Amino acid sequence: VRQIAPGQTGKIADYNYKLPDDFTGCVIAWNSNNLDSKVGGNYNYLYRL
Amino acid sequence: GKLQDVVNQNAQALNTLVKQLSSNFGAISSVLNDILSRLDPPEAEVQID
Numbered sequence: 001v002r003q004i005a006p007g008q009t010g011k012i013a014d015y016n017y018k019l020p021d022d023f024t025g026c027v028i029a030w031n032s033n034n035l036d037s038k039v040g041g042n043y044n045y046l047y048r049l
Numbered sequence: 050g051k052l053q054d055v056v057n058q059n060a061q062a063l064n065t066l067v068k069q070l071s072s073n074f075g076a077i078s079s080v081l082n083d084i085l086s087r088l089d090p091p092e093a094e095v096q097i098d
Binding site for chain 2: 009
């Protein structure tokens with residue numbers, strides 16, 4: 001979640017989507033363990049390598 | 050001497066203007082190109098500024 005900020009560099013901002021340096025707005029995140037996590041491991045969401 | 054000072058107060062005041070290009074003013078390096086080599090954009094701008 002730390003990776004979502006303007007000007008950063010990492011496995012998401014480099015290849016998934018980049019926030020512009022002049023970006024204005026807000027970022028919101030919250031807990032979804034009970035819904036998006038299942039016993040055994042969820043492979044539903046991909047990312048780039 | 051009166052004319053010799055006119056020439057000497059110009060060349061001396063001109064050399065120091067060029068000589069000011071080799072100072073840092075607080076930046077990591079005086080030369081601009083080496084700043085871009087080992088710095089990402091969003092942190093190099095504050096050094097360039």
